[PDB]
């Protein structure tokens, strides 16, 4: 199962810039033996949340040898025997041997590849180790939330340590970092806020309990068997005649929140796509090099 | 590996009806190479939440061939990452290319493959798109928690659902969470200045009804707020614990539908190629 992509007549030189991108992933649409370049392409500055949603409605595919005519590609998900394949690392900080890798859009300052003559641009998502992939998005949304409330400027928290070195985490809004990541920040902070307030509405006296015994006692009795006062959750007051301007059924908001939280959690990656298994090479690959990876 | 679920003698008026089951999945309990039909079996409909709790401790398998003597199968996921097989849609919704599939117990019941000869009947569970089974499970657990085309709840195991939900919700409350909560007014005033921000917040958001009723003072600085920072820890907890929230409630995705040559969508009641993940 290998697929090629039809390349239009770009130019001399630019074709070489493309051939120097020979290991990065691109997302096909339908597993058909003939797809065109115009198909596998996105606006190179866009909403990172929408890009993350698209990254699931598609099949991954890694670019094998490129030639002036076409460029082959191997899909990831479908397949048998887990055949290996070279994969070019494009993450900010490097990754070592034997750790799961995941795909995220260029969250930070973007790096689009732009074909001038074809009049089409391409997006190549970063490849991060699992833990740090879970961590970097939290880092950036924390920075956005800090600059949201006008508090202290920075305490030096825009650093991430990984394999000896420490990354600088470039300043925000350099190209469009403020704009491309805004909807994600909002959809996350609003959801956490919502979940917390719903919780607190469902059980009234949580925060006012013993900060060292009563709280702990509630948690340990909930985690254990179902005493739960019986119905520890107090019956909220009944709502209005359902046509008023101030009707508030807390349980419909609860179902809406469960739905939204699930649908968000889906579009966050945090599911390994491959697993580096380097052999006959340096045990660590720096950013911009090619490692032999085994698809999960 | 292939599971061999041996069958007793059945009615020729019903063996043939059971031959019409070629893409429906069944829930074993252990993975021995041989097994019996009397084993993989559930009673008629009832307690959808009990059922979905049952579909997590017992790994499933899809059947492939039905001969009058044996009935082969295939363990859905035990070591396979691309093991392509076929299974038929038996849900009310359709399914397009690419999207993952989930298994949810049969709704409303009345779908029971009755076998009067062996005196035993089955309930082949339905297959839904992911993002829609999410809504279904959310609705069911919300209505179950309400108890302090719809089946009546039980109040016996619904407390397990309420507990599993309220535990994960409670463990979201960190000393940094209130720092993020201290901007609800500052968030709302931003929501009304841009269209996208206003569209993000829903209508019955249950927080927009808080931003106009209650005031909160500046948040007190926590203990040793000069070395560490709680916002980032809070948000990492949030993402790590929300990336799997639906799983511990609903059912994990098991396969994604792929189609190489056929039409893009498969209508209900038709076999569809699939790759397991």
């Amino acid at each position: 199962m290998e697929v090629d992509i039809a390349l239009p007549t770009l130019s001399p030189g630019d074709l070489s810039a493309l051939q120097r991108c020979e290991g990065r992933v691109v997302f096909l649409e339908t597993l058909r033996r003939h797809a065109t370049l115009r198909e596998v392409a996105l606006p190179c500055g866009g909403d990172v949340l929408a890009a993350m949603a698209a990254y699931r409605r598609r099949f991954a595919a890694v670019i094998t040898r490129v030639t002036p005519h076409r460029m082959l590609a191997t899909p990831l998900g479908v397949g048998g025997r887990g055949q290996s394949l070279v994969l070019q690392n494009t993450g900010p900080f490097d990754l070592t041997n034997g750790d799961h890798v995941c795909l995220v859009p260029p969250l930070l300052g973007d790096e689009c590849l732009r074909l001038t003559s074809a009049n089409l641009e391409l997006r190549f998502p970063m490849t991060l180790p699992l833990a740090q992939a879970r961590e970097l998005t939290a880092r950036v949304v924390a920075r956005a939330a800090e600059t949201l409330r006008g508090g202290a400027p920075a305490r030096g928290a825009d650093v991430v340590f990984s394999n000896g070195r420490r990354y600088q985490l470039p300043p925000p809004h350099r190209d469009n970092a403020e704009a491309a990541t805004r909807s994600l920040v909002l959809n996350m902070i609003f959801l956490l806020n919502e979940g917390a307030v719903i919780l607190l509405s469902l059980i009234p006296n949580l925060l006012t309990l013993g900060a060292q015994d009563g709280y702990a006692n509630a948690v340990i009795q909930l985690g254990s068997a179902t005493r739960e006062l019986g119905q520890l959750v107090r019956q909220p007051p009944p709502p209005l005649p359902q046509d008023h301007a101030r009707r508030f059924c807390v349980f419909e908001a609860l179902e809406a929140w469960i739905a939204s939280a699930s649908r968000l959690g889906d579009t966050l990656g945090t599911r390994p796509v491959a697993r580096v298994c380097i052999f006959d090479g340096p045990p660590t690959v720096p950013p911009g090099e090619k490692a032999a990876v085994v698809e999960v | 590996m292939e599971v061999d679920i041996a069958l007793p003698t059945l009615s020729p008026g019903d063996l043939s009806a059971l031959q019409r089951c070629e893409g429906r999945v069944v829930f074993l309990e252990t993975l021995r190479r041989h097994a019996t039909l009397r084993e993989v079996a559930l009673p008629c409909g009832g307690d959808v939440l009990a059922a979905m709790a049952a579909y997590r401790r017992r790994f499933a398998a899809v059947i492939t061939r039905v001969t009058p003597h044996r009935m082969l199968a295939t363990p859905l996921g035990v070591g396979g990452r691309g093991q392509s097989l076929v299974l038929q849609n038996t849900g009310p919704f359709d399914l397009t290319n690419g999207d993952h599939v989930c298994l949810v117990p049969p709704l409303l019941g009345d779908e029971c493959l009755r076998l009067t000869s062996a005196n035993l009947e089955l309930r082949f569970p339905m297959t839904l798109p992911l993002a829609q089974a999410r809504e279904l499970t959310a609705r069911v657990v919300a209505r179950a928690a309400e108890t302090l085309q719809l089946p009546p709840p039980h109040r016996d195991n619904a407390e397990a659902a309420t507990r599993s939900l309220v535990l994960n919700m409670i463990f979201l409350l960190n000393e940094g969470a209130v720092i993020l909560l201290s901007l609800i007014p500052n968030l709302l005033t931003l929501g009304a200045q841009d269209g996208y921000a206003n569209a993000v917040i829903q209508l019955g958001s249950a927080t927009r009804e808080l931003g106009q009723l209650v005031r909160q003072p500046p948040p007190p600085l926590p203990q040793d707020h000069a070395r560490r920072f709680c916002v980032f820890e809070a948000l990492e907890a949030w993402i790590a614990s929300a990336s799997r929230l639906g799983d511990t409630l609903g059912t994990r995705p098991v396969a994604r539908v792929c189609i190489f040559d056929g039409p893009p969508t498969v209508p209900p009641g038709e076999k569809a190629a699939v790759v397991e993940v």
Binding site: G80 | E2, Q83
Partner: peptide, 23 residues
């Protein structure tokens, strides 16, 4: 002095099709 033990390897990779389909 050039033909078929790497042209050996080459043709009859052939009698391997399962690489089974089962986990």
């Amino acid at each position: 002095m050039s033909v078929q033990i790497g042209n050996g390897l080459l043709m009859v990779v052939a009698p391997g099709t399962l690489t089974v389909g089962s986990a």
